[PDB]
PDB file of C-alpha atoms in Angstrom:
ATOM      1  CA  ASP A  34      25.272 -26.662 -31.564  1.00  0.00           C
ATOM      2  CA  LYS A  35      27.264 -29.060 -29.620  1.00  0.00           C
ATOM      3  CA  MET A  36      29.741 -26.192 -28.258  1.00  0.00           C
ATOM      4  CA  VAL A  37      26.684 -24.473 -26.471  1.00  0.00           C
ATOM      5  CA  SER A  38      26.347 -27.254 -24.273  1.00  0.00           C
ATOM      6  CA  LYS A  39      29.125 -25.778 -22.130  1.00  0.00           C
ATOM      7  CA  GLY A  40      25.928 -25.228 -19.942  1.00  0.00           C
ATOM      8  CA  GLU A  41      26.918 -28.667 -19.508  1.00  0.00           C
ATOM      9  CA  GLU A  42      30.283 -27.820 -17.605  1.00  0.00           C
ATOM     10  CA  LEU A  43      28.486 -25.113 -15.585  1.00  0.00           C
ATOM     11  CA  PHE A  44      25.626 -27.137 -14.001  1.00  0.00           C
ATOM     12  CA  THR A  45      28.158 -30.401 -14.100  1.00  0.00           C
ATOM     13  CA  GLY A  46      28.259 -31.191 -10.174  1.00  0.00           C
ATOM     14  CA  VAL A  47      26.048 -28.797  -7.163  1.00  0.00           C
ATOM     15  CA  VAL A  48      25.641 -25.640  -7.428  1.00  0.00           C
ATOM     16  CA  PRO A  49      24.406 -22.973  -4.780  1.00  0.00           C
ATOM     17  CA  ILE A  50      21.503 -21.063  -5.477  1.00  0.00           C
ATOM     18  CA  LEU A  51      20.763 -17.582  -4.040  1.00  0.00           C
ATOM     19  CA  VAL A  52      16.859 -16.217  -4.309  1.00  0.00           C
ATOM     20  CA  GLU A  53      16.094 -12.407  -2.922  1.00  0.00           C
ATOM     21  CA  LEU A  54      12.724 -11.006  -3.401  1.00  0.00           C
ATOM     22  CA  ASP A  55      11.547  -7.486  -2.612  1.00  0.00           C
ATOM     23  CA  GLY A  56       7.453  -7.960  -2.742  1.00  0.00           C
ATOM     24  CA  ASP A  57       4.721  -5.483  -2.874  1.00  0.00           C
ATOM     25  CA  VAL A  58       1.101  -6.807  -2.778  1.00  0.00           C
ATOM     26  CA  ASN A  59      -2.420  -3.859  -2.341  1.00  0.00           C
ATOM     27  CA  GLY A  60       0.718  -2.334  -0.406  1.00  0.00           C
ATOM     28  CA  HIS A  61       2.011  -4.692   1.803  1.00  0.00           C
ATOM     29  CA  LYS A  62       5.938  -4.942   1.371  1.00  0.00           C
ATOM     30  CA  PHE A  63       8.322  -7.851   2.302  1.00  0.00           C
ATOM     31  CA  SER A  64      11.416  -9.676   1.573  1.00  0.00           C
ATOM     32  CA  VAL A  65      12.253 -13.284   1.034  1.00  0.00           C
ATOM     33  CA  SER A  66      16.122 -14.748   0.987  1.00  0.00           C
ATOM     34  CA  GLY A  67      16.097 -18.088  -0.350  1.00  0.00           C
ATOM     35  CA  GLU A  68      19.590 -20.416  -0.100  1.00  0.00           C
ATOM     36  CA  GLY A  69      20.266 -24.024  -1.152  1.00  0.00           C
ATOM     37  CA  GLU A  70      21.855 -25.968  -4.010  1.00  0.00           C
ATOM     38  CA  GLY A  71      20.710 -27.424  -7.550  1.00  0.00           C
ATOM     39  CA  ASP A  72      21.693 -30.501  -9.511  1.00  0.00           C
ATOM     40  CA  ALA A  73      21.031 -30.207 -12.807  1.00  0.00           C
ATOM     41  CA  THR A  74      21.605 -33.537 -13.830  1.00  0.00           C
ATOM     42  CA  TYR A  75      19.023 -35.115 -11.448  1.00  0.00           C
ATOM     43  CA  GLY A  76      16.726 -31.939 -12.397  1.00  0.00           C
ATOM     44  CA  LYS A  77      16.753 -31.204  -8.561  1.00  0.00           C
ATOM     45  CA  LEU A  78      16.415 -28.001  -6.262  1.00  0.00           C
ATOM     46  CA  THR A  79      16.734 -28.074  -2.728  1.00  0.00           C
ATOM     47  CA  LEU A  80      16.180 -24.561  -1.294  1.00  0.00           C
ATOM     48  CA  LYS A  81      15.156 -22.908   2.457  1.00  0.00           C
ATOM     49  CA  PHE A  82      12.849 -19.536   2.207  1.00  0.00           C
ATOM     50  CA  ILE A  83      12.649 -17.103   5.006  1.00  0.00           C
ATOM     51  CA  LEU A  84      10.463 -13.934   5.591  1.00  0.00           C
ATOM     52  CA  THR A  85      13.384 -11.599   6.203  1.00  0.00           C
ATOM     53  CA  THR A  86      11.142  -7.734   6.158  1.00  0.00           C
ATOM     54  CA  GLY A  87       7.504  -7.300   6.353  1.00  0.00           C
ATOM     55  CA  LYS A  88       4.658  -9.579   7.730  1.00  0.00           C
ATOM     56  CA  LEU A  89       4.162 -12.452   4.404  1.00  0.00           C
ATOM     57  CA  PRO A  90       0.992 -10.955   2.980  1.00  0.00           C
ATOM     58  CA  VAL A  91       0.306 -13.643   0.717  1.00  0.00           C
ATOM     59  CA  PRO A  92       0.454 -17.934   1.036  1.00  0.00           C
ATOM     60  CA  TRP A  93       3.829 -19.261   0.054  1.00  0.00           C
ATOM     61  CA  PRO A  94       2.629 -21.648  -2.389  1.00  0.00           C
ATOM     62  CA  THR A  95       1.818 -18.144  -4.407  1.00  0.00           C
ATOM     63  CA  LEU A  96       5.443 -17.647  -4.638  1.00  0.00           C
ATOM     64  CA  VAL A  97       6.814 -21.016  -5.638  1.00  0.00           C
ATOM     65  CA  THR A  98       7.331 -20.341  -9.214  1.00  0.00           C
ATOM     66  CA  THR A  99       8.357 -16.412  -9.154  1.00  0.00           C
ATOM     67  CA  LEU A 100      11.015 -17.716  -6.215  1.00  0.00           C
ATOM     68  CA  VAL A 102      15.524 -21.373 -11.751  1.00  0.00           C
ATOM     69  CA  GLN A 103      14.218 -23.381 -14.625  1.00  0.00           C
ATOM     70  CA  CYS A 104      18.602 -24.043 -15.577  1.00  0.00           C
ATOM     71  CA  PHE A 105      18.191 -26.941 -12.873  1.00  0.00           C
ATOM     72  CA  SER A 106      15.722 -28.382 -14.788  1.00  0.00           C
ATOM     73  CA  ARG A 107      17.028 -31.881 -16.411  1.00  0.00           C
ATOM     74  CA  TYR A 108      17.182 -31.643 -20.237  1.00  0.00           C
ATOM     75  CA  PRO A 109      17.617 -35.484 -21.513  1.00  0.00           C
ATOM     76  CA  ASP A 110      20.752 -36.221 -23.574  1.00  0.00           C
ATOM     77  CA  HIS A 111      18.353 -36.160 -26.953  1.00  0.00           C
ATOM     78  CA  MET A 112      16.885 -32.924 -26.033  1.00  0.00           C
ATOM     79  CA  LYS A 113      20.181 -30.873 -24.467  1.00  0.00           C
ATOM     80  CA  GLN A 114      20.210 -28.387 -27.738  1.00  0.00           C
ATOM     81  CA  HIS A 115      16.852 -26.992 -26.487  1.00  0.00           C
ATOM     82  CA  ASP A 116      18.176 -26.099 -22.989  1.00  0.00           C
ATOM     83  CA  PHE A 117      17.850 -22.039 -22.918  1.00  0.00           C
ATOM     84  CA  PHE A 118      18.103 -21.114 -19.660  1.00  0.00           C
ATOM     85  CA  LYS A 119      21.789 -23.065 -19.553  1.00  0.00           C
ATOM     86  CA  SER A 120      22.948 -21.568 -22.904  1.00  0.00           C
ATOM     87  CA  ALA A 121      22.502 -18.239 -21.754  1.00  0.00           C
ATOM     88  CA  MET A 122      24.422 -18.908 -18.383  1.00  0.00           C
ATOM     89  CA  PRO A 123      27.132 -17.511 -16.935  1.00  0.00           C
ATOM     90  CA  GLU A 124      25.867 -13.808 -17.844  1.00  0.00           C
ATOM     91  CA  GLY A 125      22.269 -15.229 -17.645  1.00  0.00           C
ATOM     92  CA  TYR A 126      18.734 -14.359 -18.375  1.00  0.00           C
ATOM     93  CA  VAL A 127      16.061 -11.712 -17.549  1.00  0.00           C
ATOM     94  CA  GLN A 128      12.873 -13.875 -16.524  1.00  0.00           C
ATOM     95  CA  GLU A 129       9.352 -11.902 -16.581  1.00  0.00           C
ATOM     96  CA  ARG A 130       6.183 -13.121 -15.979  1.00  0.00           C
ATOM     97  CA  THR A 131       2.291 -11.819 -15.497  1.00  0.00           C
ATOM     98  CA  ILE A 132       0.185 -14.127 -13.510  1.00  0.00           C
ATOM     99  CA  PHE A 133      -3.831 -14.012 -13.031  1.00  0.00           C
ATOM    100  CA  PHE A 134      -5.507 -15.632  -9.693  1.00  0.00           C
ATOM    101  CA  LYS A 135      -8.827 -16.567 -11.247  1.00  0.00           C
ATOM    102  CA  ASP A 136     -11.437 -14.192  -9.467  1.00  0.00           C
ATOM    103  CA  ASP A 137      -8.703 -12.334  -7.631  1.00  0.00           C
ATOM    104  CA  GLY A 138      -5.689  -9.908  -8.243  1.00  0.00           C
ATOM    105  CA  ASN A 139      -2.281 -10.500 -10.294  1.00  0.00           C
ATOM    106  CA  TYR A 140       1.342 -10.604 -10.169  1.00  0.00           C
ATOM    107  CA  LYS A 141       3.514  -8.782 -12.125  1.00  0.00           C
ATOM    108  CA  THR A 142       7.588 -10.045 -11.701  1.00  0.00           C
ATOM    109  CA  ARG A 143      10.748  -9.013 -13.281  1.00  0.00           C
ATOM    110  CA  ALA A 144      13.939 -11.272 -12.214  1.00  0.00           C
ATOM    111  CA  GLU A 145      17.403 -11.365 -12.852  1.00  0.00           C
ATOM    112  CA  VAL A 146      19.021 -14.943 -12.975  1.00  0.00           C
ATOM    113  CA  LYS A 147      23.002 -15.438 -13.530  1.00  0.00           C
ATOM    114  CA  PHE A 148      25.925 -16.245 -12.145  1.00  0.00           C
ATOM    115  CA  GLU A 149      27.348 -14.351  -9.594  1.00  0.00           C
ATOM    116  CA  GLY A 150      30.980 -16.366  -8.823  1.00  0.00           C
ATOM    117  CA  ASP A 151      30.513 -20.261  -8.112  1.00  0.00           C
ATOM    118  CA  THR A 152      26.840 -19.161  -7.533  1.00  0.00           C
ATOM    119  CA  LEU A 153      23.691 -19.049  -9.246  1.00  0.00           C
ATOM    120  CA  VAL A 154      21.578 -15.710  -8.337  1.00  0.00           C
ATOM    121  CA  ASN A 155      17.811 -14.932  -8.561  1.00  0.00           C
ATOM    122  CA  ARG A 156      16.930 -10.744  -7.889  1.00  0.00           C
ATOM    123  CA  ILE A 157      12.715 -10.623  -7.956  1.00  0.00           C
ATOM    124  CA  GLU A 158      11.006  -7.495  -7.971  1.00  0.00           C
ATOM    125  CA  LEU A 159       7.572  -8.292  -7.792  1.00  0.00           C
ATOM    126  CA  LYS A 160       3.886  -5.887  -7.402  1.00  0.00           C
ATOM    127  CA  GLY A 161       0.602  -7.833  -6.869  1.00  0.00           C
ATOM    128  CA  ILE A 162      -2.689  -5.442  -7.297  1.00  0.00           C
ATOM    129  CA  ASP A 163      -6.463  -5.487  -7.320  1.00  0.00           C
ATOM    130  CA  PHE A 164      -6.208  -8.743  -4.776  1.00  0.00           C
ATOM    131  CA  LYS A 165      -9.646  -9.365  -3.006  1.00  0.00           C
ATOM    132  CA  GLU A 166      -9.742  -8.490   0.849  1.00  0.00           C
ATOM    133  CA  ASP A 167     -11.975 -11.514   1.077  1.00  0.00           C
ATOM    134  CA  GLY A 168     -10.642 -13.928  -1.423  1.00  0.00           C
ATOM    135  CA  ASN A 169      -8.172 -16.771  -1.300  1.00  0.00           C
ATOM    136  CA  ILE A 170      -4.552 -15.462  -1.228  1.00  0.00           C
ATOM    137  CA  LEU A 171      -4.989 -12.161   0.959  1.00  0.00           C
ATOM    138  CA  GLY A 172      -7.597 -14.350   2.979  1.00  0.00           C
ATOM    139  CA  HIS A 173      -5.076 -17.373   3.368  1.00  0.00           C
ATOM    140  CA  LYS A 174      -7.232 -20.122   2.448  1.00  0.00           C
ATOM    141  CA  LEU A 175      -5.003 -22.375   0.726  1.00  0.00           C
ATOM    142  CA  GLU A 176      -2.954 -25.753   1.574  1.00  0.00           C
ATOM    143  CA  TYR A 177       0.562 -25.758   2.115  1.00  0.00           C
ATOM    144  CA  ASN A 178       0.783 -28.489  -0.633  1.00  0.00           C
ATOM    145  CA  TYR A 179       1.598 -28.379  -4.816  1.00  0.00           C
ATOM    146  CA  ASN A 180       0.807 -30.064  -7.248  1.00  0.00           C
ATOM    147  CA  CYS A 181       2.904 -31.875 -10.060  1.00  0.00           C
ATOM    148  CA  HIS A 182       2.224 -29.304 -13.482  1.00  0.00           C
ATOM    149  CA  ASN A 183       3.941 -29.029 -17.058  1.00  0.00           C
ATOM    150  CA  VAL A 184       5.624 -25.741 -18.281  1.00  0.00           C
ATOM    151  CA  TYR A 185       5.214 -25.041 -22.315  1.00  0.00           C
ATOM    152  CA  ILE A 186       8.014 -23.590 -23.928  1.00  0.00           C
ATOM    153  CA  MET A 187       8.443 -21.877 -27.344  1.00  0.00           C
ATOM    154  CA  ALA A 188      11.194 -20.136 -28.862  1.00  0.00           C
ATOM    155  CA  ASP A 189      10.207 -16.117 -29.262  1.00  0.00           C
ATOM    156  CA  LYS A 190      13.399 -15.250 -31.585  1.00  0.00           C
ATOM    157  CA  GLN A 191      12.663 -11.278 -32.093  1.00  0.00           C
ATOM    158  CA  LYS A 192      13.788 -11.602 -28.262  1.00  0.00           C
ATOM    159  CA  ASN A 193      16.618 -14.059 -28.386  1.00  0.00           C
ATOM    160  CA  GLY A 194      14.895 -16.220 -26.056  1.00  0.00           C
ATOM    161  CA  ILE A 195      11.594 -18.359 -25.182  1.00  0.00           C
ATOM    162  CA  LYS A 196       7.461 -17.475 -24.208  1.00  0.00           C
ATOM    163  CA  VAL A 197       6.351 -19.820 -21.402  1.00  0.00           C
ATOM    164  CA  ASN A 198       2.889 -20.211 -20.059  1.00  0.00           C
ATOM    165  CA  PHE A 199       1.208 -22.652 -17.888  1.00  0.00           C
ATOM    166  CA  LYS A 200      -1.979 -22.603 -15.258  1.00  0.00           C
ATOM    167  CA  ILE A 201      -1.090 -23.444 -11.566  1.00  0.00           C
ATOM    168  CA  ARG A 202      -3.406 -25.494  -9.514  1.00  0.00           C
ATOM    169  CA  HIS A 203      -3.339 -24.515  -5.896  1.00  0.00           C
ATOM    170  CA  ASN A 204      -5.558 -26.798  -3.920  1.00  0.00           C
ATOM    171  CA  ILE A 205      -8.160 -25.240  -1.074  1.00  0.00           C
ATOM    172  CA  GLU A 206      -8.821 -27.720   2.303  1.00  0.00           C
ATOM    173  CA  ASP A 207     -12.315 -28.077   0.735  1.00  0.00           C
ATOM    174  CA  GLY A 208     -11.574 -30.351  -2.643  1.00  0.00           C
ATOM    175  CA  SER A 209     -11.590 -26.787  -4.700  1.00  0.00           C
ATOM    176  CA  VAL A 210      -8.808 -24.998  -6.670  1.00  0.00           C
ATOM    177  CA  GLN A 211      -7.635 -21.219  -6.918  1.00  0.00           C
ATOM    178  CA  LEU A 212      -5.890 -21.057 -10.102  1.00  0.00           C
ATOM    179  CA  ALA A 213      -2.892 -19.027 -11.310  1.00  0.00           C
ATOM    180  CA  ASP A 214      -2.491 -18.631 -14.986  1.00  0.00           C
ATOM    181  CA  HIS A 215       0.811 -17.627 -15.905  1.00  0.00           C
ATOM    182  CA  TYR A 216       2.662 -15.872 -19.171  1.00  0.00           C
ATOM    183  CA  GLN A 217       6.423 -15.827 -18.822  1.00  0.00           C
ATOM    184  CA  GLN A 218       9.078 -14.374 -21.331  1.00  0.00           C
ATOM    185  CA  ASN A 219      12.899 -14.864 -20.939  1.00  0.00           C
ATOM    186  CA  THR A 220      15.107 -12.899 -22.672  1.00  0.00           C
ATOM    187  CA  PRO A 221      19.042 -13.107 -22.200  1.00  0.00           C
ATOM    188  CA  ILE A 222      21.527 -10.511 -20.807  1.00  0.00           C
ATOM    189  CA  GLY A 223      24.620 -11.672 -23.021  1.00  0.00           C
ATOM    190  CA  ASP A 224      25.135 -10.156 -26.470  1.00  0.00           C
ATOM    191  CA  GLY A 225      26.587 -13.867 -27.491  1.00  0.00           C
ATOM    192  CA  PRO A 226      23.972 -16.787 -29.023  1.00  0.00           C
ATOM    193  CA  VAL A 227      21.670 -19.339 -27.030  1.00  0.00           C
ATOM    194  CA  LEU A 228      19.655 -22.422 -27.987  1.00  0.00           C
ATOM    195  CA  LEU A 229      16.639 -21.682 -29.304  1.00  0.00           C
ATOM    196  CA  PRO A 230      14.304 -24.339 -28.975  1.00  0.00           C
ATOM    197  CA  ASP A 231      11.677 -26.572 -30.564  1.00  0.00           C
ATOM    198  CA  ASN A 232       8.071 -26.316 -28.983  1.00  0.00           C
ATOM    199  CA  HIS A 233       8.661 -28.843 -25.618  1.00  0.00           C
ATOM    200  CA  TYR A 234       7.790 -28.943 -21.751  1.00  0.00           C
ATOM    201  CA  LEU A 235       9.348 -29.158 -18.116  1.00  0.00           C
ATOM    202  CA  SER A 236       7.185 -31.868 -15.733  1.00  0.00           C
ATOM    203  CA  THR A 237       7.668 -30.038 -12.537  1.00  0.00           C
ATOM    204  CA  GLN A 238       7.025 -31.527  -8.988  1.00  0.00           C
ATOM    205  CA  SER A 239       7.213 -29.676  -5.901  1.00  0.00           C
ATOM    206  CA  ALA A 240       7.147 -30.750  -1.948  1.00  0.00           C
ATOM    207  CA  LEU A 241       6.476 -27.916   0.753  1.00  0.00           C
ATOM    208  CA  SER A 242       7.760 -28.928   4.503  1.00  0.00           C
ATOM    209  CA  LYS A 243       8.890 -26.521   7.168  1.00  0.00           C
ATOM    210  CA  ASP A 244      12.417 -26.743   9.377  1.00  0.00           C
ATOM    211  CA  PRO A 245      11.098 -28.021  12.556  1.00  0.00           C
ATOM    212  CA  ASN A 246      13.735 -25.442  14.479  1.00  0.00           C
ATOM    213  CA  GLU A 247      13.038 -22.473  12.468  1.00  0.00           C
ATOM    214  CA  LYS A 248      11.171 -19.686  14.523  1.00  0.00           C
ATOM    215  CA  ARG A 249      10.605 -17.453  11.384  1.00  0.00           C
ATOM    216  CA  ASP A 250       7.617 -17.590   8.682  1.00  0.00           C
ATOM    217  CA  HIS A 251       9.530 -19.931   5.885  1.00  0.00           C
ATOM    218  CA  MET A 252       9.483 -22.579   3.340  1.00  0.00           C
ATOM    219  CA  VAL A 253      11.856 -25.447   2.640  1.00  0.00           C
ATOM    220  CA  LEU A 254      10.877 -26.562  -1.199  1.00  0.00           C
ATOM    221  CA  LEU A 255      12.321 -29.583  -2.893  1.00  0.00           C
ATOM    222  CA  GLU A 256      11.457 -29.783  -6.652  1.00  0.00           C
ATOM    223  CA  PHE A 257      12.134 -31.876  -9.369  1.00  0.00           C
ATOM    224  CA  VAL A 258      12.235 -30.585 -12.857  1.00  0.00           C
ATOM    225  CA  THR A 259      12.405 -32.783 -16.360  1.00  0.00           C
ATOM    226  CA  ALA A 260      12.048 -31.599 -19.952  1.00  0.00           C
ATOM    227  CA  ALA A 261       9.961 -33.863 -22.360  1.00  0.00           C
ATOM    228  CA  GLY A 262       8.176 -33.743 -25.864  1.00  0.00           C
ATOM    229  CA  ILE A 263      10.833 -34.147 -28.443  1.00  0.00           C
TER     230      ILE A 263
END
């Protein structure tokens, strides 16, 4: 619906982002605070994440996906397939199950919504069955991130979307740790949304550090474009 691209209006300029993650992995508890801004016109995310509570029990790269696909650039001809924006400002619940091959898994539950002029992401994560000797707990993954595809279809029974994709986490010996992602997003609002044709997001990510941040942290720079229509 032409009108339903009022999401255009809410994501027109630069939008401040807040992310908050209460986390638990084989009993190890921790919190992450994210702040930064989005430019949906450009697919653009700039965010800085800081460990705020506990010792960080897993590699930063494993948490990227968990830590706002509303900031994805939908080309003009595809804009009527942008669910994430069509759900705002009252937002959607994102839920994921994530299996790391030969190791444990993450189950996540997130509210993404506007809280004023600001786009917020509240995240409860539990992970279980992680091999102590494995790459995750064993901290054996590079601080880099591969370009990925993200397959979307409508889940009309939930008035929302089914999402799935494989993440490739590089280990320094040239091998790869796989995270297999299963993702349902449901809206929170009682109103209509854009239910898309089958399509995907092409997602670039760049992980850096603040030279002056004394705390365990992650500065993430991410670019997402939709395609396949």
